């Protein structure tokens, strides 16, 4: 481990993804992929 | 790095003609009133970095 801890859980926010809660604007990002 | 408007003649790495950088190897001749700026070949002086934001509370001594 020269990278250290953190790769396996990277990118999942404790206050958002981990709680299945969405932030105030991430919907705009997904709309840009779909619409 | 954000290039912002040249503020003195002879500067470079700053916006000179419109929203275009006047790069290294050139220098900005600032127009007076009614004159356009011109980015010409020549040795310029980079426009200096703007004052960094130092308006945070002082961090404790441990972090020298």
């Amino acid at each position: 481990k020269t990278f250290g801890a953190g790769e396996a859980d990277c990118g999942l926010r404790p206050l958002f993804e981990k709680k299945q809660v969405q932030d105030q604007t991430e919907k705009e990002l997904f709309e840009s992929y779909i619409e | 790095v954000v290039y912002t408007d040249c503020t003195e003649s002879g500067q470079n790495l700053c916006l000179x003609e419109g929203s275009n950088v006047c790069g290294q190897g050139n220098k900005x001749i600032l127009g007076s009133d009614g004159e356009k700026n011109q980015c010409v070949t020549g040795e310029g002086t980079p426009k200096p970095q703007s004052h960094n934001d130092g308006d945070f509370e002082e961090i404790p001594e441990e972090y020298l």
Partner: protein, 257 residues
């Protein structure tokens, strides 16, 4: 960040502030990619036009920070080592504008401190399309210019803005600067309805995109350079992280590192 808004608490737990140690001032943004590695732009550390060439002794990073006091939640760290990409070309308008900072000691993660993911081949294939929006965050100026003092444009809380990827031909036609494959641009077109850009002080910080496939956030870009902030018909430019991933892995995987 121009035309942004105040970030929610915990929105960007990978956000890092790079600070000069003395005098204490904000230099750049950066991002946490593990418990001991920070990613930023090379020009935040080495920029000969400003006689800038920092050593580890000159710098600190702050992680976990949301707002200026006007507690137990931020971490201040020293750096062990700086790594700048071997082919960073500050004469070639910041081609390969990427650097890694090794933290002096591994940090604990928390609700406010957590690493972002780096993209792989599939992530780049899925997410990098013109019109898809990503998100830029930072502590930089809220406008390019001010009337009286720069303090006018300084934010009290981390700012965020979402911005669309722009087609490469449009990026190239928007500037006379030579754009390489190691850069991309983002931002709204004039009369697209909305605005927004990174600005001074946001350089080095992350452009992230959320994958719908695995619900995770990936850092696709590093704020690199702009001609002004939020000017109509101009776009901000970002280091293309995936294009430089082989170097990141090399550095991280080195036995000494």
């Amino acid at each position: 960040i121009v035309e942004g808004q105040d970030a929610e608490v915990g929105l960007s737990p990978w956000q890092v502030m790079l600070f000069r140690k003395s005098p204490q001032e904000l230099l750049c943004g950066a991002s946490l990619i593990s418990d001991r590695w920070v990613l930023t732009a090379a020009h935040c550390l080495l920029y000969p036009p400003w006689d800038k060439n920092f050593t580890v002794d000159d710098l600190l990073v702050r992680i976990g920070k949301h707002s200026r006091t006007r507690r137990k939640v931020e971490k201040i760290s020293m750096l062990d080592k700086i790594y700048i990409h071997p082919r960073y070309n500050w004469k070639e308008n910041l081609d390969r504008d990427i650097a890694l900072l090794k933290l002096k000691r591994p940090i604990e993660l928390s609700d406010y401190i957590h690493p972002v993911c780096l993209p792989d081949k599939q992530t780049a294939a899925k997410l990098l399309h013109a019109g898809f929006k990503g998100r830029v965050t930072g502590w930089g100026n809220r406008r390019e210019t001010w009337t009286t003092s720069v303090a006018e444009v300084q934010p009290s809380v981390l700012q965020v803005v979402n911005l669309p990827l722009v087609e490469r031909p449009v990026c190239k036609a928007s500037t006379r600067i030579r754009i390489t494959d190691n850069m991309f641009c983002a931002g709204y077109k004039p009369g697209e309805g909305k605005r927004g850009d990174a600005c001074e002080g946001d350089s080095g910080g992350p452009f992230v995109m959320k994958s719908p496939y695995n619900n995770r956030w990936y850092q696709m870009g590093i704020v690199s350079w702009g001609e002004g902030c939020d000017r109509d018909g101009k776009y901000g430019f970002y280091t293309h992280v995936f294009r430089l991933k082989k170097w990141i892995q090399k550095v991280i995987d080195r036995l000494g590192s």
